[PDB]
Amino acid sequence: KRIVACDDPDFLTSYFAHSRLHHLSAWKANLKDKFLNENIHKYTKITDKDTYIIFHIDFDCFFATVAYLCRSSSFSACDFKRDPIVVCHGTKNSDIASCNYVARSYGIKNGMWVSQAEKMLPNGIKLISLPYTFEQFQLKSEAFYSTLKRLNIFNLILPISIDEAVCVRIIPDTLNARLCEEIRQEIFQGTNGCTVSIGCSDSLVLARLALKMAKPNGYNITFKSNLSEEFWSSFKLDDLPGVGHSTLSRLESTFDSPHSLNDLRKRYTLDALKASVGSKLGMKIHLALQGQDDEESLKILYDPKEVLQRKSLSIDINWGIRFKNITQVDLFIERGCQYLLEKLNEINKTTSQITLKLMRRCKDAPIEPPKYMGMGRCDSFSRSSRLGIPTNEFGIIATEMKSLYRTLGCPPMELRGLALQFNKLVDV
DNA sequence: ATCCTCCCCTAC
DNA sequence: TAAGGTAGGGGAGGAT
Ligand SMILES: Nc1ccn([C@H]2C[C@H](O)[C@@H](COP(=O)(O)OP(=O)(O)OP(=O)(O)O)O2)c(=O)n1
Ligand SMILES: [Mg+2]
Numbered sequence: 001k002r003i004v005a006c007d008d009p010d011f012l013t014s015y016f017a018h019s020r021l022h023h024l025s026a027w028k029a030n031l032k033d034k035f036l037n038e039n040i041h042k043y044t045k046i047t048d049k050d051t052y053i054i055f056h057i058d059f060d061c062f063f064a065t066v067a068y069l070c071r072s073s074s075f076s077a078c079d080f081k082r083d084p085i086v087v088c089h090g091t092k093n094s095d096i097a098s099c100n101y102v103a104r105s106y107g108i109k110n111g112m113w114v115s116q117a118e119k120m121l122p123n124g125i126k127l128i129s130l131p132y133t134f135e136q137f138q139l140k141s142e143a144f145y146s147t148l149k150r151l152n153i154f155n156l157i158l159p160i161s162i163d164e165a166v167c168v169r170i171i172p173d174t175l176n177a178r179l180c181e182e183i184r185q186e187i188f189q190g191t192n193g194c195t196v197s198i199g200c201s202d203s204l205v206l207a208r209l210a211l212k213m214a215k216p217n218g219y220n221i222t223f224k225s226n227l228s229e230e231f232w233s234s235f236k237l238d239d240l241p242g243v244g245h246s247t248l249s250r251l252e253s254t255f256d257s258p259h260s261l262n263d264l265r266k267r268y269t270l271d272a273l274k275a276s277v278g279s280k281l282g283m284k285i286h287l288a289l290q291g292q293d294d295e296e297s298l299k300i301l302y303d304p305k306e307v308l309q310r311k312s313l314s315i316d317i318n319w320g321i322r323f324k325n326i327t328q329v330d331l332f333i334e335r336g337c338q339y340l341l342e343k344l345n346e347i348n349k350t351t352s353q354i355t356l357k358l359m360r361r362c363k364d365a366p367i368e369p370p371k372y373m374g375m376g377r378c379d380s381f382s383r384s385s386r387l388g389i390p391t392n393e394f395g396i397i398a399t400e401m402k403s404l405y406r407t408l409g410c411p412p413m414e415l416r417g418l419a420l421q422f423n424k425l426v427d428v
Numbered sequence: 429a430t431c432c433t434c435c436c437c438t439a440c
Numbered sequence: 441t442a443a444g445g446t447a448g449g450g451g452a453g454g455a456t
């Protein structure tokens with residue numbers, strides 16, 4: 001019991017063992033690598049000449065499904081179909097990593113705090129909190145990916161995350177529904193009780209939207225030609241890939257608060273969209289609302305090996321950071337370089353460029369944030385440097401990192417988060 | 429134009 | 441209390 005503090009040599013070990021976000025990142029990097037290792041001698045890229053169907057396949061409320069299947073006996077009482085269930089560490093300002101669809105019927109969402117969620121429950125409804133079972137998440141994910149491989153359906157299986165894969169069938173010069181059904185069935189068995197939904201389309205963007213539409217335990221087909229207003233009407237603006245909270249808020253401020261993708265598509269003009277959200281992103285949204293992928297998104301089909309090749313490496317710690325003096329900070333920075341250099345040597349790379357980035361308490365923010373041990377409201381400060389030669393040397397790297405911290409000049413007592421980055425990685 | 433640094437955003 | 445990580449697209453503004 002009793003959490004290891006940031007000035008302890010084993011902070012990172014203990015914090016990473018508990019952070020579900022760190023697992024998500026680690027599992028993602030490992031799946032990319034596993035992809036590169038398995039396809040060393042496989043000719044891999046899709047062409048413009050190629051005709052293809054995307055099957056975007058994703059576990060439903062993963063984590064809540066798997067924590068529930070693996071639950072301890074003191075929750076046998078529990079019932080996935082009727083009870084609101086979440087997976088989380090605590091009881092107040094503690095993130096809900098995953099909630100089941102009964103929880104979502106009350107308005108509860110994945111990154112919400114437990115205290116916020118319990119306000120949403122009417123009288124006589126009790127939130128059930130399950131613990132994380134990281135090993136088990138990983139076992140179901142393995143069963144998933146081996147099951148996909150074993151059916152011999154796809155020309156290519158792109159790992160996007162621990163519970164999600166984009167699968168491509170190449171069609172030379174009805175079936176699709178049976179294939180959806182087989183995949184959902186075989187994954188449900190190979191996994192034991194877990195459910196997957198499937199979006200199937202001729203675009204990556206439509207497949208992702210079809211997936212959302214399918215989503216409690218179903219599949220949904222939807223091609224560029226099946227687009228209708230009743231389809232677009234069913235999606236929030238941030239159901240678009242690449243649109244999240246800031247873009248939502250900009251889209252709303254520009255197009256008088258459109259409430260569904262349908263309302264947006266009827267109101268927007270390419271020009272105003274670009275001026276609003278960026279251009280690129282605006283361009284992406286534009287193409288999306290016609291069912292089409294932007295060029296950036298497509299690189300993953302036209303060259304998976306490149307897109308999936310890791311181009312940088314870092315840690316980023318924004319919880320539990322509390323220091324009194326620079327000695328503690330320097331030692332921490334040194335430990336973080338030690339950790340990172342073990343990773344760098346494991347992937348047989350060196351670095352030519354480094355960044356130290358930090359979160360500093362805003363002038364106006366309480367010294368102790370509402371979230372226990374949290375970073376609270378902060379400003380970002382970042383500085384990078386080019387190394388003369390690519391190296392994996394501790395002395396070069398740790399010294400420049402401690403040097404970069406002095407240049408940003410954050411008093412230790414104000415530090416609330418810190419990131420150490422190797423931008424630019426050089427082979428061999 | 430283009431490139432570089434310091435961010436912001438999104439994903440999951 | 442509680443574990444707010446991390447890769448990588450992208451833009452603004454200065455430097456060339
Ligand atoms: N803010 C978030 C979002 C997700 N994850 C974790 C837990 C989720 O179970 C898993 C996969 O994330 P998804 O976005 O796919 O969401 P779910 O699988 O939970 O729900 P859905 O049925 O909407 O796919 O990643 C998390 O910890 N915090
Ligand atoms: Mg999911």
Ligand SMILES: [Mg+2]
Binds near residue numbers: 058059161163164440
């Ligand atoms: Mg997912």
